Amino acid sequence: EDLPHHDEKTWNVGSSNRNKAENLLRGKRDGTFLVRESSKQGCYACSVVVDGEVKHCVINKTATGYGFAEPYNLYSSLKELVLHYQHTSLVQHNDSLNVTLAYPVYAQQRR
């Protein structure tokens, strides 16, 4: 059916505090991830949950920055980042993050 990626609130929880994020990250099966801001700083970051621990991936939008974007790959919008980040394995990070952003943190809850 429709994918919850079209919904920003499904993975966007910038309003959630870092401590609140732990609760959101806690109780979630591996694969679930959330996107949030540095709160007051313009820096962005998404946290993911792994069978091993909760992680805080960093994302940064700049004239030429976004977090995921290398000469080989270059994401123009965050919406595309979330879609591909679900098909990309985080293992590459710390060479031990065997997981893929599979479902938004607020995907199961809809208004």
mmCIF file of N, CA and C in Angstrom:
data_model
loop_
_atom_site.group_PDB
_atom_site.id
_atom_site.type_symbol
_atom_site.label_atom_id
_atom_site.label_comp_id
_atom_site.label_asym_id
_atom_site.label_seq_id
_atom_site.Cartn_x
_atom_site.Cartn_y
_atom_site.Cartn_z
ATOM 1 N N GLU A 1 0.861 -1.213 0.000
ATOM 2 C CA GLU A 1 0.000 0.000 0.000
ATOM 3 C C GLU A 1 0.881 1.243 0.000
ATOM 4 N N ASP A 2 0.382 2.326 0.512
ATOM 5 C CA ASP A 2 1.194 3.565 0.553
ATOM 6 C C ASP A 2 2.362 3.358 1.517
ATOM 7 N N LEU A 3 3.494 3.939 1.231
ATOM 8 C CA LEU A 3 4.658 3.777 2.143
ATOM 9 C C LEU A 3 4.670 4.957 3.117
ATOM 10 N N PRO A 4 4.963 4.710 4.361
ATOM 11 C CA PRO A 4 4.981 5.770 5.409
ATOM 12 C C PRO A 4 6.126 6.761 5.204
ATOM 13 N N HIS A 5 6.942 6.526 4.219
ATOM 14 C CA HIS A 5 8.074 7.452 3.952
ATOM 15 C C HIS A 5 7.514 8.798 3.490
ATOM 16 N N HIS A 6 6.375 8.783 2.850
ATOM 17 C CA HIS A 6 5.755 10.056 2.382
ATOM 18 C C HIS A 6 5.422 10.906 3.610
ATOM 19 N N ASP A 7 5.287 10.267 4.744
ATOM 20 C CA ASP A 7 4.967 10.996 6.002
ATOM 21 C C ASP A 7 6.252 11.375 6.741
ATOM 22 N N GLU A 8 6.461 12.645 6.946
ATOM 23 C CA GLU A 8 7.677 13.110 7.660
ATOM 24 C C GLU A 8 7.589 12.707 9.134
ATOM 25 N N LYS A 9 6.424 12.826 9.710
ATOM 26 C CA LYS A 9 6.247 12.486 11.152
ATOM 27 C C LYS A 9 6.503 10.994 11.412
ATOM 28 N N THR A 10 6.425 10.165 10.408
ATOM 29 C CA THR A 10 6.673 8.708 10.630
ATOM 30 C C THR A 10 8.123 8.479 11.064
ATOM 31 N N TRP A 11 9.040 9.220 10.518
ATOM 32 C CA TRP A 11 10.464 9.031 10.903
ATOM 33 C C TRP A 11 11.012 10.323 11.512
ATOM 34 N N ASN A 12 10.321 11.410 11.336
ATOM 35 C CA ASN A 12 10.806 12.704 11.893
ATOM 36 C C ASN A 12 10.274 12.912 13.313
ATOM 37 N N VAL A 13 11.158 13.040 14.265
ATOM 38 C CA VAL A 13 10.725 13.274 15.669
ATOM 39 C C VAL A 13 11.640 14.333 16.289
ATOM 40 N N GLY A 14 12.039 15.297 15.505
ATOM 41 C CA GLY A 14 12.945 16.365 16.019
ATOM 42 C C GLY A 14 12.397 16.940 17.326
ATOM 43 N N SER A 15 11.102 17.006 17.469
ATOM 44 C CA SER A 15 10.529 17.552 18.732
ATOM 45 C C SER A 15 10.938 16.650 19.896
ATOM 46 N N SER A 16 11.083 15.376 19.643
ATOM 47 C CA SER A 16 11.471 14.429 20.729
ATOM 48 C C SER A 16 12.848 14.815 21.284
ATOM 49 N N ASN A 17 13.008 14.758 22.580
ATOM 50 C CA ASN A 17 14.318 15.120 23.206
ATOM 51 C C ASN A 17 15.280 13.933 23.121
ATOM 52 N N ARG A 18 16.552 14.168 23.321
ATOM 53 C CA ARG A 18 17.535 13.048 23.247
ATOM 54 C C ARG A 18 17.142 11.957 24.246
ATOM 55 N N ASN A 19 16.791 12.327 25.447
ATOM 56 C CA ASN A 19 16.382 11.299 26.442
ATOM 57 C C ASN A 19 15.089 10.639 25.959
ATOM 58 N N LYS A 20 14.174 11.424 25.467
ATOM 59 C CA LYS A 20 12.900 10.854 24.958
ATOM 60 C C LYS A 20 13.225 9.903 23.807
ATOM 61 N N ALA A 21 14.209 10.241 23.021
ATOM 62 C CA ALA A 21 14.592 9.373 21.877
ATOM 63 C C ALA A 21 14.990 7.987 22.393
ATOM 64 N N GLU A 22 15.647 7.921 23.520
ATOM 65 C CA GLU A 22 16.050 6.591 24.055
ATOM 66 C C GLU A 22 14.792 5.747 24.246
ATOM 67 N N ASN A 23 13.766 6.321 24.813
ATOM 68 C CA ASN A 23 12.506 5.563 25.005
ATOM 69 C C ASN A 23 11.967 5.168 23.630
ATOM 70 N N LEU A 24 11.987 6.086 22.700
ATOM 71 C CA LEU A 24 11.500 5.778 21.330
ATOM 72 C C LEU A 24 12.407 4.720 20.711
ATOM 73 N N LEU A 25 13.689 4.833 20.934
ATOM 74 C CA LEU A 25 14.634 3.833 20.370
ATOM 75 C C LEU A 25 14.533 2.558 21.198
ATOM 76 N N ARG A 26 14.214 2.704 22.450
ATOM 77 C CA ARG A 26 14.063 1.524 23.331
ATOM 78 C C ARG A 26 12.700 0.881 23.098
ATOM 79 N N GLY A 27 12.653 -0.419 23.012
ATOM 80 C CA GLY A 27 11.348 -1.105 22.796
ATOM 81 C C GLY A 27 11.113 -1.319 21.300
ATOM 82 N N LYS A 28 11.941 -0.748 20.474
ATOM 83 C CA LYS A 28 11.760 -0.909 19.009
ATOM 84 C C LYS A 28 12.650 -2.045 18.496
ATOM 85 N N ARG A 29 12.126 -2.862 17.625
ATOM 86 C CA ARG A 29 12.935 -3.990 17.076
ATOM 87 C C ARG A 29 14.031 -3.427 16.167
ATOM 88 N N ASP A 30 15.031 -4.211 15.877
ATOM 89 C CA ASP A 30 16.133 -3.721 15.002
ATOM 90 C C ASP A 30 15.557 -3.335 13.636
ATOM 91 N N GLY A 31 16.062 -2.292 13.033
ATOM 92 C CA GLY A 31 15.535 -1.869 11.699
ATOM 93 C C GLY A 31 14.753 -0.565 11.848
ATOM 94 N N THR A 32 14.149 -0.359 12.980
ATOM 95 C CA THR A 32 13.376 0.893 13.194
ATOM 96 C C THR A 32 14.353 2.046 13.449
ATOM 97 N N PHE A 33 14.135 3.184 12.839
ATOM 98 C CA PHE A 33 15.060 4.327 13.074
ATOM 99 C C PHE A 33 14.245 5.614 13.153
ATOM 100 N N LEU A 34 14.814 6.653 13.682
ATOM 101 C CA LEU A 34 14.056 7.924 13.780
ATOM 102 C C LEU A 34 14.946 9.074 13.314
ATOM 103 N N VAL A 35 14.351 10.134 12.851
ATOM 104 C CA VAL A 35 15.151 11.297 12.395
ATOM 105 C C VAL A 35 14.871 12.458 13.340
ATOM 106 N N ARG A 36 15.874 13.197 13.718
ATOM 107 C CA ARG A 36 15.634 14.322 14.659
ATOM 108 C C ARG A 36 16.657 15.420 14.404
ATOM 109 N N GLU A 37 16.479 16.567 14.997
ATOM 110 C CA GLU A 37 17.458 17.659 14.785
ATOM 111 C C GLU A 37 18.382 17.731 15.991
ATOM 112 N N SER A 38 19.364 18.580 15.949
ATOM 113 C CA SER A 38 20.247 18.710 17.126
ATOM 114 C C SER A 38 19.460 19.550 18.123
ATOM 115 N N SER A 39 18.212 19.757 17.783
ATOM 116 C CA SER A 39 17.264 20.529 18.631
ATOM 117 C C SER A 39 17.394 22.030 18.347
ATOM 118 N N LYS A 40 18.412 22.661 18.868
ATOM 119 C CA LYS A 40 18.575 24.125 18.635
ATOM 120 C C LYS A 40 19.605 24.371 17.530
ATOM 121 N N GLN A 41 20.523 23.464 17.327
ATOM 122 C CA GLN A 41 21.536 23.674 16.251
ATOM 123 C C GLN A 41 20.954 23.213 14.914
ATOM 124 N N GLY A 42 21.378 23.816 13.837
ATOM 125 C CA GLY A 42 20.837 23.436 12.499
ATOM 126 C C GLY A 42 21.388 22.077 12.052
ATOM 127 N N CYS A 43 22.128 21.401 12.890
ATOM 128 C CA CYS A 43 22.681 20.076 12.484
ATOM 129 C C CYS A 43 21.582 19.018 12.604
ATOM 130 N N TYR A 44 21.556 18.068 11.708
ATOM 131 C CA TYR A 44 20.502 17.013 11.769
ATOM 132 C C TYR A 44 21.137 15.661 12.091
ATOM 133 N N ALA A 45 20.357 14.717 12.546
ATOM 134 C CA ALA A 45 20.927 13.386 12.874
ATOM 135 C C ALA A 45 19.794 12.370 13.011
ATOM 136 N N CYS A 46 20.016 11.152 12.602
ATOM 137 C CA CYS A 46 18.945 10.131 12.736
ATOM 138 C C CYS A 46 19.481 9.002 13.593
ATOM 139 N N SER A 47 18.692 8.522 14.498
ATOM 140 C CA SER A 47 19.179 7.434 15.377
ATOM 141 C C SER A 47 18.548 6.115 14.952
ATOM 142 N N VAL A 48 19.294 5.051 15.034
ATOM 143 C CA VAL A 48 18.750 3.741 14.614
ATOM 144 C C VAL A 48 18.890 2.739 15.758
ATOM 145 N N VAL A 49 18.112 1.699 15.727
ATOM 146 C CA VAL A 49 18.202 0.670 16.797
ATOM 147 C C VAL A 49 18.803 -0.604 16.207
ATOM 148 N N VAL A 50 19.786 -1.167 16.851
ATOM 149 C CA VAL A 50 20.420 -2.393 16.297
ATOM 150 C C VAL A 50 20.358 -3.537 17.312
ATOM 151 N N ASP A 51 20.339 -4.747 16.822
ATOM 152 C CA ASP A 51 20.272 -5.938 17.713
ATOM 153 C C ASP A 51 21.338 -5.837 18.790
ATOM 154 N N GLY A 52 22.239 -4.931 18.632
ATOM 155 C CA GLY A 52 23.318 -4.783 19.637
ATOM 156 C C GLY A 52 23.066 -3.553 20.507
ATOM 157 N N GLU A 53 22.803 -2.414 19.913
ATOM 158 C CA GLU A 53 22.573 -1.197 20.750
ATOM 159 C C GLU A 53 21.845 -0.108 19.955
ATOM 160 N N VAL A 54 21.536 0.984 20.608
ATOM 161 C CA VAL A 54 20.864 2.125 19.921
ATOM 162 C C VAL A 54 21.956 3.044 19.366
ATOM 163 N N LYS A 55 21.826 3.494 18.149
ATOM 164 C CA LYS A 55 22.894 4.366 17.572
ATOM 165 C C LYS A 55 22.356 5.759 17.229
ATOM 166 N N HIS A 56 23.249 6.704 17.069
ATOM 167 C CA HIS A 56 22.836 8.095 16.725
ATOM 168 C C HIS A 56 23.545 8.534 15.438
ATOM 169 N N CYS A 57 23.099 8.056 14.304
ATOM 170 C CA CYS A 57 23.752 8.448 13.018
ATOM 171 C C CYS A 57 23.640 9.965 12.833
ATOM 172 N N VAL A 58 24.626 10.574 12.226
ATOM 173 C CA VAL A 58 24.590 12.057 12.041
ATOM 174 C C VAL A 58 24.293 12.433 10.587
ATOM 175 N N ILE A 59 23.426 13.389 10.389
ATOM 176 C CA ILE A 59 23.116 13.860 9.014
ATOM 177 C C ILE A 59 23.361 15.373 8.990
ATOM 178 N N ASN A 60 23.900 15.915 7.930
ATOM 179 C CA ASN A 60 24.176 17.384 7.940
ATOM 180 C C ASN A 60 23.929 18.006 6.565
ATOM 181 N N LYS A 61 23.019 18.947 6.483
ATOM 182 C CA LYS A 61 22.732 19.600 5.171
ATOM 183 C C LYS A 61 23.557 20.885 5.019
ATOM 184 N N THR A 62 24.393 20.940 4.013
ATOM 185 C CA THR A 62 25.230 22.156 3.787
ATOM 186 C C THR A 62 25.274 22.458 2.281
ATOM 187 N N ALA A 63 25.716 23.630 1.889
ATOM 188 C CA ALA A 63 25.770 23.943 0.428
ATOM 189 C C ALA A 63 26.188 22.675 -0.313
ATOM 190 N N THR A 64 27.052 21.905 0.289
ATOM 191 C CA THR A 64 27.512 20.642 -0.346
ATOM 192 C C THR A 64 27.577 19.527 0.710
ATOM 193 N N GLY A 65 26.627 19.473 1.615
ATOM 194 C CA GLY A 65 26.655 18.411 2.670
ATOM 195 C C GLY A 65 25.240 17.870 2.913
ATOM 196 N N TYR A 66 25.139 16.679 3.450
ATOM 197 C CA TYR A 66 23.804 16.066 3.718
ATOM 198 C C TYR A 66 23.985 14.832 4.603
ATOM 199 N N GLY A 67 25.204 14.430 4.830
ATOM 200 C CA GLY A 67 25.454 13.217 5.662
ATOM 201 C C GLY A 67 25.855 12.075 4.725
ATOM 202 N N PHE A 68 24.912 11.550 3.991
ATOM 203 C CA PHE A 68 25.224 10.460 3.026
ATOM 204 C C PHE A 68 25.398 11.088 1.641
ATOM 205 N N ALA A 69 26.589 11.107 1.116
ATOM 206 C CA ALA A 69 26.784 11.725 -0.226
ATOM 207 C C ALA A 69 28.267 11.699 -0.592
ATOM 208 N N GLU A 70 28.666 10.722 -1.351
ATOM 209 C CA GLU A 70 30.092 10.619 -1.764
ATOM 210 C C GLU A 70 30.158 10.685 -3.289
ATOM 211 N N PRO A 71 31.254 11.126 -3.836
ATOM 212 C CA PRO A 71 31.411 11.220 -5.304
ATOM 213 C C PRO A 71 30.672 10.086 -6.007
ATOM 214 N N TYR A 72 30.755 8.899 -5.477
ATOM 215 C CA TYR A 72 30.036 7.759 -6.098
ATOM 216 C C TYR A 72 28.523 7.955 -5.905
ATOM 217 N N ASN A 73 28.110 8.340 -4.717
ATOM 218 C CA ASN A 73 26.649 8.559 -4.451
ATOM 219 C C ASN A 73 26.415 10.002 -3.966
ATOM 220 N N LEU A 74 25.330 10.617 -4.361
ATOM 221 C CA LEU A 74 25.058 12.017 -3.919
ATOM 222 C C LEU A 74 23.551 12.215 -3.728
ATOM 223 N N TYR A 75 23.090 12.148 -2.511
ATOM 224 C CA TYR A 75 21.632 12.324 -2.252
ATOM 225 C C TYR A 75 21.269 13.811 -2.257
ATOM 226 N N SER A 76 20.251 14.174 -2.991
ATOM 227 C CA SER A 76 19.839 15.606 -3.057
ATOM 228 C C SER A 76 18.797 15.930 -1.976
ATOM 229 N N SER A 77 17.922 15.009 -1.647
ATOM 230 C CA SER A 77 16.891 15.316 -0.604
ATOM 231 C C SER A 77 16.910 14.253 0.500
ATOM 232 N N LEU A 78 16.448 14.609 1.675
ATOM 233 C CA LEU A 78 16.427 13.639 2.812
ATOM 234 C C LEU A 78 15.417 12.528 2.534
ATOM 235 N N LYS A 79 14.383 12.833 1.803
ATOM 236 C CA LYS A 79 13.358 11.801 1.491
ATOM 237 C C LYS A 79 14.049 10.645 0.761
ATOM 238 N N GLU A 80 14.919 10.960 -0.160
ATOM 239 C CA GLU A 80 15.656 9.899 -0.899
ATOM 240 C C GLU A 80 16.623 9.207 0.067
ATOM 241 N N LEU A 81 17.187 9.950 0.983
ATOM 242 C CA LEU A 81 18.133 9.347 1.966
ATOM 243 C C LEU A 81 17.411 8.260 2.754
ATOM 244 N N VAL A 82 16.255 8.572 3.271
ATOM 245 C CA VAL A 82 15.499 7.569 4.069
ATOM 246 C C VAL A 82 15.163 6.359 3.194
ATOM 247 N N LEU A 83 14.738 6.580 1.982
ATOM 248 C CA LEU A 83 14.386 5.428 1.105
ATOM 249 C C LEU A 83 15.619 4.549 0.845
ATOM 250 N N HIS A 84 16.711 5.124 0.418
ATOM 251 C CA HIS A 84 17.931 4.304 0.146
ATOM 252 C C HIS A 84 18.552 3.813 1.463
ATOM 253 N N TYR A 85 18.516 4.617 2.494
ATOM 254 C CA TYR A 85 19.114 4.190 3.798
ATOM 255 C C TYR A 85 18.399 2.921 4.279
ATOM 256 N N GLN A 86 17.215 2.675 3.784
ATOM 257 C CA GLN A 86 16.477 1.440 4.184
ATOM 258 C C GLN A 86 17.025 0.263 3.382
ATOM 259 N N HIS A 87 17.570 0.525 2.225
ATOM 260 C CA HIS A 87 18.122 -0.583 1.400
ATOM 261 C C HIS A 87 19.632 -0.666 1.620
ATOM 262 N N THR A 88 20.187 0.285 2.325
ATOM 263 C CA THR A 88 21.651 0.262 2.585
ATOM 264 C C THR A 88 21.906 -0.352 3.961
ATOM 265 N N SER A 89 22.921 -1.164 4.082
ATOM 266 C CA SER A 89 23.216 -1.798 5.396
ATOM 267 C C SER A 89 24.119 -0.873 6.214
ATOM 268 N N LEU A 90 23.759 -0.618 7.442
ATOM 269 C CA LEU A 90 24.591 0.277 8.299
ATOM 270 C C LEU A 90 25.890 -0.435 8.695
ATOM 271 N N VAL A 91 25.936 -1.735 8.560
ATOM 272 C CA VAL A 91 27.166 -2.485 8.954
ATOM 273 C C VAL A 91 28.406 -1.683 8.595
ATOM 274 N N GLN A 92 28.426 -1.071 7.443
ATOM 275 C CA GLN A 92 29.625 -0.288 7.035
ATOM 276 C C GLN A 92 30.073 0.633 8.168
ATOM 277 N N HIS A 93 29.163 1.087 8.981
ATOM 278 C CA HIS A 93 29.561 1.987 10.097
ATOM 279 C C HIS A 93 30.041 1.139 11.271
ATOM 280 N N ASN A 94 31.186 1.458 11.811
ATOM 281 C CA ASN A 94 31.722 0.651 12.937
ATOM 282 C C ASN A 94 31.859 -0.793 12.454
ATOM 283 N N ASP A 95 31.654 -1.013 11.182
ATOM 284 C CA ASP A 95 31.774 -2.390 10.628
ATOM 285 C C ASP A 95 31.055 -3.365 11.552
ATOM 286 N N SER A 96 29.976 -2.947 12.146
ATOM 287 C CA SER A 96 29.249 -3.863 13.058
ATOM 288 C C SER A 96 27.796 -3.425 13.181
ATOM 289 N N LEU A 97 27.338 -2.586 12.299
ATOM 290 C CA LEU A 97 25.922 -2.150 12.394
ATOM 291 C C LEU A 97 25.129 -2.927 11.363
ATOM 292 N N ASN A 98 24.900 -4.173 11.630
ATOM 293 C CA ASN A 98 24.161 -5.013 10.662
ATOM 294 C C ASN A 98 22.663 -4.740 10.772
ATOM 295 N N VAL A 99 22.202 -3.733 10.087
ATOM 296 C CA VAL A 99 20.757 -3.392 10.126
ATOM 297 C C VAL A 99 20.440 -2.433 8.984
ATOM 298 N N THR A 100 19.190 -2.293 8.670
ATOM 299 C CA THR A 100 18.781 -1.369 7.580
ATOM 300 C C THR A 100 17.584 -0.563 8.061
ATOM 301 N N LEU A 101 17.598 0.731 7.893
ATOM 302 C CA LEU A 101 16.421 1.518 8.326
ATOM 303 C C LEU A 101 15.204 0.866 7.676
ATOM 304 N N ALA A 102 14.532 0.002 8.373
ATOM 305 C CA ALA A 102 13.384 -0.686 7.737
ATOM 306 C C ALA A 102 12.066 0.060 7.977
ATOM 307 N N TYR A 103 11.743 0.389 9.201
ATOM 308 C CA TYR A 103 10.440 1.077 9.447
ATOM 309 C C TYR A 103 10.611 2.352 10.286
ATOM 310 N N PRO A 104 9.931 3.421 9.922
ATOM 311 C CA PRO A 104 9.978 4.697 10.698
ATOM 312 C C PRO A 104 9.652 4.462 12.173
ATOM 313 N N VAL A 105 10.023 5.372 13.025
ATOM 314 C CA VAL A 105 9.726 5.195 14.476
ATOM 315 C C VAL A 105 8.235 5.446 14.731
ATOM 316 N N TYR A 106 7.631 6.318 13.969
ATOM 317 C CA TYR A 106 6.177 6.598 14.149
ATOM 318 C C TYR A 106 5.409 6.084 12.932
ATOM 319 N N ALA A 107 5.862 5.004 12.364
ATOM 320 C CA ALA A 107 5.178 4.431 11.175
ATOM 321 C C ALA A 107 3.922 3.675 11.616
ATOM 322 N N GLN A 108 4.014 2.928 12.682
ATOM 323 C CA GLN A 108 2.836 2.147 13.159
ATOM 324 C C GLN A 108 1.741 3.087 13.673
ATOM 325 N N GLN A 109 2.107 4.230 14.188
ATOM 326 C CA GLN A 109 1.078 5.174 14.719
ATOM 327 C C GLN A 109 0.668 6.171 13.639
ATOM 328 N N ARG A 110 -0.604 6.270 13.376
ATOM 329 C CA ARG A 110 -1.081 7.218 12.339
ATOM 330 C C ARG A 110 -2.215 8.063 12.907
ATOM 331 N N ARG A 111 -2.350 9.264 12.434
ATOM 332 C CA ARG A 111 -3.426 10.154 12.937
ATOM 333 C C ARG A 111 -4.480 10.339 11.843
#
